[PDB]
Design a protein around this ligand. Structure first.
Ligand code: 8HB
Lengths: 9, 168
């Protein structure tokens, strides 16, 4: 779905 | 009288305006409309501190938008070891201080690669904090799309620019 990626520590 | 339009910077091919939280309701309603358009293009279904910057074409169309909000810290995006035989990124655990969070940034697809996004980020840096010009190490981007990561690394001139998720 969404175009934003995920960003984690 | 009807309040004045807040022009930040002007160019041959348009102008950058800003909507602030205390502006008239028709302005805040225009800002909401634009945010809904942008979230829809990003594929998202659905306050007193965000500023909405808009790049307005000479035909009076909003062809760029940048939603900015105050933040206090952000995190360097880091490289991930590739997998040998082949979407989430990992950031530094050390927060760094930051002032301005770029929550959304969007340019009309047929007008991309014409420095609209770069000029909008310049305008934010020049106007977000009264009397100061923010450096590229005082801004951060929320969970970038692939387009956004390419833009941000070029604009900030480093691969490990600052990122944050969202102010809750
Ligand atoms: C969450 O919202 C986060 C805030 S990230 C959201 C990013 N927005 C999107 O993903 C929506 C759709 N994409 C866009 O709206 C646009 O691609 C951007 C807003 C990301 C970029 O807008 P613009 O096209 O106006 O950027 P610039 O002209 O100012 O580019 C300056 C330099 O940035 C590099 N670059 C930009 N865009 C690139 C893309 N697709 N691919 C590769 N590199 C890209 C270039 O180096 C560019 O300089 P040039 O002289 O054009 O090379």
């Amino acid at each position: 779905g969404a175009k934003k990626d995920q960003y984690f520590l | 009288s009807m309040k004045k339009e807040r022009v930040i910077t002007e160019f041959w091919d348009g102008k950058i305006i800003m909507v602030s939280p205390d502006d008239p309701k028709y302005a805040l309603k225009k800002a909401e409309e634009v945010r809904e358009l942008v979230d829809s293009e990003l594929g998202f279904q659905q306050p007193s501190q965000t500023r909405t910057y808009m790049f307005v074409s000479n035909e009076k169309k909003i062809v760029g938008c940048l939603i900015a909000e105050p933040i206090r810290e952000a995190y360097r995006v880091l490289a991930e070891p590739p997998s040998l035989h082949s979407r989430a990124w990992r950031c530094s655990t050390e927060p760094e201080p930051a002032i301005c969070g770029i929550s959304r940034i969007w340019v009309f697809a047929l007008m991309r690669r014409k420095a609209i996004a770069s000029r909008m980020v310049d305008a934010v840096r020049s106007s977000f904090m009264y009397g100061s010009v923010l450096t590229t190490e005082e801004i951060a981007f929320s969970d970038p799309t692939p387009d956004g990561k390419l833009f941000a690394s070029t604009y900030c001139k480093v691969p490990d620019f600052l990122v944050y998720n969202f102010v809750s």
